[PDB]
Amino acid sequence: YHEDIHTYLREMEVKCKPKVGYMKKQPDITNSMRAILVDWLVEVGEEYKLQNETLHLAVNYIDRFLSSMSVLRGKLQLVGTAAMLLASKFEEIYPPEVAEFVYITDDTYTKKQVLRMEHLVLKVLTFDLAAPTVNQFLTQYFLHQQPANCKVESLAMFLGELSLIDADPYLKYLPSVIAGAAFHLALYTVTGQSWPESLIRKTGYTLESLKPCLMDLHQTYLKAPQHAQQSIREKYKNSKYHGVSLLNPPETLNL
Amino acid sequence: DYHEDIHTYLREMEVKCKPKVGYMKKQPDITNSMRAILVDWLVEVGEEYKLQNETLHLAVNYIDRFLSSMSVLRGKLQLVGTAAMLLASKFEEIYPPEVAEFVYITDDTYTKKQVLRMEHLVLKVLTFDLAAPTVNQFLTQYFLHQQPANCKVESLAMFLGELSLIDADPYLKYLPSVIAGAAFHLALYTVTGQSWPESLIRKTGYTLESLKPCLMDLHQTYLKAPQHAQQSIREKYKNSKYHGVSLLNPPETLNL
Amino acid sequence: MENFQKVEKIGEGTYGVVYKARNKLTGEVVALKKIRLDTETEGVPSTAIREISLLKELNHPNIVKLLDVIHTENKLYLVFEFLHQDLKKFMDASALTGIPLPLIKSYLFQLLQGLAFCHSHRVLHRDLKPQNLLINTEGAIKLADFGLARAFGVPVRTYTHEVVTLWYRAPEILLGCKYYSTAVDIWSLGCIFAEMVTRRALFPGDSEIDQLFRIFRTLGTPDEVVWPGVTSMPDYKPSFPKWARQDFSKVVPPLDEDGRSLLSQMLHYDPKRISAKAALAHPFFQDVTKPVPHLRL
Amino acid sequence: MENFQKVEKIGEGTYGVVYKARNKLTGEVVALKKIRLDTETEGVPSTAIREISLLKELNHPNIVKLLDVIHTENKLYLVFEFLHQDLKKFMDASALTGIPLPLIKSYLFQLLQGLAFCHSHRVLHRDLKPQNLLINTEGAIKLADFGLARAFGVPVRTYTHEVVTLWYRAPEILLGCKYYSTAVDIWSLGCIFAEMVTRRALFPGDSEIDQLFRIFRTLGTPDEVVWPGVTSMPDYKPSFPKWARQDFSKVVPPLDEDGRSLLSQMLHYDPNKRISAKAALAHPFFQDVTKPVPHLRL
Ligand SMILES: CN1CCN(c2cccc3nc(-c4n[nH]c5cc(-c6ccc(N)cc6)ccc45)[nH]c23)CC1
Numbered sequence A: 001y002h003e004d005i006h007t008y009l010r011e012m013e014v015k016c017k018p019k020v021g022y023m024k025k026q027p028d029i030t031n032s033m034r035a036i037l038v039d040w041l042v043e044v045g046e047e048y049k050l051q052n053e054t055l056h057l058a059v060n061y062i063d064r065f066l067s068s069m070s071v072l073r074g075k076l077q078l079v080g081t082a083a084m085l086l087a088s089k090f091e092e093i094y095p096p097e098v099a100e101f102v103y104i105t106d107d108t109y110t111k112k113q114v115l116r117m118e119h120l121v122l123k124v125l126t127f128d129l130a131a132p133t134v135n136q137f138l139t140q141y142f143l144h145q146q147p148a149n150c151k152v153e154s155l156a157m158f159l160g161e162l163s164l165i166d167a168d169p170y171l172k173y174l175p176s177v178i179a180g181a182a183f184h185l186a187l188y189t190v191t192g193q194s195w196p197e198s199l200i201r202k203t204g205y206t207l208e209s210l211k212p213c214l215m216d217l218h219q220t221y222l223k224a225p226q227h228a229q230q231s232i233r234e235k236y237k238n239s240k241y242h243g244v245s246l247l248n249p250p251e252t253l254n255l
Numbered sequence B: 001d002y003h004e005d006i007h008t009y010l011r012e013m014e015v016k017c018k019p020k021v022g023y024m025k026k027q028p029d030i031t032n033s034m035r036a037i038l039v040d041w042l043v044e045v046g047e048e049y050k051l052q053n054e055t056l057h058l059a060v061n062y063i064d065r066f067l068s069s070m071s072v073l074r075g076k077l078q079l080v081g082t083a084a085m086l087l088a089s090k091f092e093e094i095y096p097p098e099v100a101e102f103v104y105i106t107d108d109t110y111t112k113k114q115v116l117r118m119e120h121l122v123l124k125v126l127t128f129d130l131a132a133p134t135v136n137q138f139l140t141q142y143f144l145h146q147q148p149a150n151c152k153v154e155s156l157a158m159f160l161g162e163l164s165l166i167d168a169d170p171y172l173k174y175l176p177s178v179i180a181g182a183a184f185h186l187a188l189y190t191v192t193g194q195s196w197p198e199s200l201i202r203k204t205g206y207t208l209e210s211l212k213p214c215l216m217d218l219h220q221t222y223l224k225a226p227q228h229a230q231q232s233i234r235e236k237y238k239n240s241k242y243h244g245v246s247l248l249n250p251p252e253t254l255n256l
Numbered sequence C: 001m002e003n004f005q006k007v008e009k010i011g012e013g014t015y016g017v018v019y020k021a022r023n024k025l026t027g028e029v030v031a032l033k034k035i036r037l038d039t040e041t042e043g044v045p046s047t048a049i050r051e052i053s054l055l056k057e058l059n060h061p062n063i064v065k066l067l068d069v070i071h072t073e074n075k076l077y078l079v080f081e082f083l084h085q086d087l088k089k090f091m092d093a094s095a096l097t098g099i100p101l102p103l104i105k106s107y108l109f110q111l112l113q114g115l116a117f118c119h120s121h122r123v124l125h126r127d128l129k130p131q132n133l134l135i136n137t138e139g140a141i142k143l144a145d146f147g148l149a150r151a152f153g154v155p156v157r158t159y160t161h162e163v164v165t166l167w168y169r170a171p172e173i174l175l176g177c178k179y180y181s182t183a184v185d186i187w188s189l190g191c192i193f194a195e196m197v198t199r200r201a202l203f204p205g206d207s208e209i210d211q212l213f214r215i216f217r218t219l220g221t222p223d224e225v226v227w228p229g230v231t232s233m234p235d236y237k238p239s240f241p242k243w244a245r246q247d248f249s250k251v252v253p254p255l256d257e258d259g260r261s262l263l264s265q266m267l268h269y270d271p272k273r274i275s276a277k278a279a280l281a282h283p284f285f286q287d288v289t290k291p292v293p294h295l296r297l
Numbered sequence D: 001m002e003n004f005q006k007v008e009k010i011g012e013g014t015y016g017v018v019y020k021a022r023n024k025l026t027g028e029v030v031a032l033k034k035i036r037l038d039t040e041t042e043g044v045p046s047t048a049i050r051e052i053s054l055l056k057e058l059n060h061p062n063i064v065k066l067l068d069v070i071h072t073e074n075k076l077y078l079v080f081e082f083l084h085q086d087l088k089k090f091m092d093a094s095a096l097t098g099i100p101l102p103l104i105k106s107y108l109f110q111l112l113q114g115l116a117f118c119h120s121h122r123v124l125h126r127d128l129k130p131q132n133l134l135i136n137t138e139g140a141i142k143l144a145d146f147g148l149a150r151a152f153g154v155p156v157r158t159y160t161h162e163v164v165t166l167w168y169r170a171p172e173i174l175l176g177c178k179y180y181s182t183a184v185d186i187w188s189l190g191c192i193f194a195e196m197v198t199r200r201a202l203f204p205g206d207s208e209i210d211q212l213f214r215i216f217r218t219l220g221t222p223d224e225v226v227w228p229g230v231t232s233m234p235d236y237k238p239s240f241p242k243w244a245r246q247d248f249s250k251v252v253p254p255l256d257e258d259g260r261s262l263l264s265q266m267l268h269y270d271p272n273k274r275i276s277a278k279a280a281l282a283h284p285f286f287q288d289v290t291k292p293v294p295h296l297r298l
């Protein structure tokens, strides 16, 4: 059934796609503002000890919402708050209460606003909350590790999380493909090995097919210390992630 | 200039307006026969109120799409059709019959409020997507490729296309463009002995080979028309407005 | 409707009002068209039915976007993108100066792109007049008010009644033709084009016969050579005066040689009248830009 | 909500009630689950969020259809297809001579088809018990109540609270495993299967330890040979008494050779080796499956 599930996740990731160019059609907000929002959601997740999956789901919800709704810069954070609340309810065993989400916004929004935005996002997403994520595909790929290596897993997760910050270029890749590039790049950085044949058979993705995404991801990895948004680097220098954000990236992938 | 673009656009939209082919099986209380009776009755109502043929076709499209996602009890099937005809009239007619007229034709089996509430429900269920392509629209488009025009052919094509509305099996599984193509060829062959023209093959991309399955069914419907339990369309098309084309004898074979 | 704050009334109609409104959750400024539902007598008006169903098929930058339909108990609201004013008021505001020609060219170019899209999607607008055309501060113009609009996969039958205010009505309609064609939208746009250039209605008729005659006086009384079939049309009379066609250089003085050629093809008597698509390829638009208007708000 | 006539209350819950209702315009008989929305403190409950979002991905004849969600001001209604009663009441009604074996086989076959679909769509039910299983007069049975159900594209963390009533809870959960697997659904179905055959709960434990020991007494105390890893599991104690596995011929007398084989595979200790829903459908037990109609006392 692990094959059935990968197959089903591959089907659903093509359907949960947001519009790649939505930010151009958006009058008041920009990629930078989105970057700031997502970085903030990482902090909130650390503050409330939320699962990584909750973060990925929330960002998926935000991109799909913004693909069909114009939002003013002063309401962008209300969208993110409601998205994180909904993602927590879907994914967490016990989510933070609504009052908690109102307080991380420094009382910029009211309980009523947040609860009304929750309703609006559910309407706009048509209750389709079980979206595939980079996280889910990474988790499935990790079962093809010969043998398991926690430093590789942490770095793969780190790179996958960095992809959430920059709509350009990562909105135009499928989660399964971003996951594949993150796995290879982490595997290559820690152990010197490459995208294994077992995953080639499972996913049908070659190292050739991952190359475009891989080159973007590698470039993001090299520039991570210079990025204006730093919450993910800070998070991944923790012991729980084996300080993988302090590891040096490869200068070349030799593809 | 624009009748190529419009045909192209209609071909795109007919793939999207498709109801579920097998919806009647998943429907507990109503059957194809009951649908046949409903559609035949809608033909009468169109004749009674002098409604356009397009209005009939739209109404049937609305009914099939509604029934594709909603369970209806036999005693409410007619309320669905009434609301559908009402909406189709509003969309297509220059001035539609008032609501009280639609309550009238149902012999007071339903109320004004019921009909107006069902109108709201059907609009919700169809999500206001009322501009559906029909066999009628594609026939109209194909008639512009007649060398030269022949009103007997046009009336017979329209007659056959209208017969296709009555029987969900087998006509739900064909696109309007395809049913239109078969009706045109069959009428053209019956009246003038000619075949699906090369100009339409280029325009539609359909060959006489590709139309064959639908043609097969349509020819069989045409042969059995006098025996069908529903007769409103045959009666309608023996009028002088339609050159009495429902009396024309069909060929016994098609020679394909 | 709970998430919408009514800002002000911006428009009054037959079936209801148009308000400027603000989405309280997103900040999006919108136009809300309210339709009161008489739930004893009529149900959803035919205007709303056509307007909703046709407009949601028409996503184009020069056609006003329908954003949402909030359909409930006894009210129907249409949510649209908000624009800043109509072309009629802009024309009135520009009386002591005219709309500059580059902005006129821009506006006609965009209106034709909107119209071409409508026509390619088998939609006839049928009511193109300056107050149904909406503009913004960025230099965009869009088609609005699709209440009279019609799908024409099957030819659209002419009315006795209700239609295109007299001044933008095409000759075939006045002469009682049986079916509309896309030519009627092109005719109206020709009239609007001339009006922008000259600062006056091209054909301000007081009545149907007066409307026809004003067209005849400018363009010449049509005959069988100019328009094969005219004399057989229902409302044609042989008693019609026979006026001569006058120079376009005197009808639209400020227009150059290319502008005159485009307008004459848009005002062609035989509905041989230029298509929107063919008009877009006209040398008149070979230097079109997108200037911004001085909207006196 | 204007077009619905309330017929009767048919179910009470935590977040709200279930009514039998009738669509006034179409005549469709429906189950309406009403959810009152506390719009100061909580918003839309996690149970509704999961059940709506997962169920609308699950169109199958053996999974109760969600027909509509009417989401408004301060109320959320879920509209479902209407079924006629749950399996628990049908079991009680059938106490003085059992559900016939052909109907039991039918019901288990259908339930495994419903489950296989769930699992292929990465959904864990997590709360399969007889009162969450709905039946109709035409012989259908379907999975219901997906309030605790969860997507497992990422492995689902077990909790220390809340769910699967104790009697249908799997040994790995009792022994404090960290993640759920699809095996827990299969376990519960095994218990339900046995309960239909014998007319009694297989493992009616009064507590967690008591639940475990009732399983041990029937199936034998698990060791590292039968279940590699048992002895390292959080809530495993070496003090656990060591019982012997007893004959299935005495646990489920009325079952034939094939029936016992399937049940033993569904109650296998090691979750990795416990039979999948798909594999269970290919079992010779189902080779002569029919679809009898029951006689419900409505
Ligand atoms: C007569 N005029 C019209 C312009 N009015 C006006 C003034 C100032 C700002 C205005 N904004 C609008 C407007 N924005 N979006 C609209 C959409 C429709 C719509 C309605 C129906 C359809 N079908 C499509 C779009 C009508 C009007 C508007 N109209 C404004 C002043 C009065």
Ligand SMILES: CN1CCN(c2cccc3nc(-c4n[nH]c5cc(-c6ccc(N)cc6)ccc45)[nH]c23)CC1
Pocket (backbone or CB within 6 Å): D010, D011, D012, D018, D031, D033, D051, D055, D064, D080, D081, D082, D083, D084, D085, D086, D131, D132, D134, D143, D144, D145, D146, D147
């Ligand atoms: C404990 N029992 C259960 C059976 N109850 C009952 C009795 C008599 C007739 C009944 N009809 C239902 C019913 N039909 N459809 C349903 C859908 C859900 C649903 C709700 C939520 C989800 N997620 C899926 C399906 C729950 C219950 C029902 N339940 C009935 C009596 C009380």
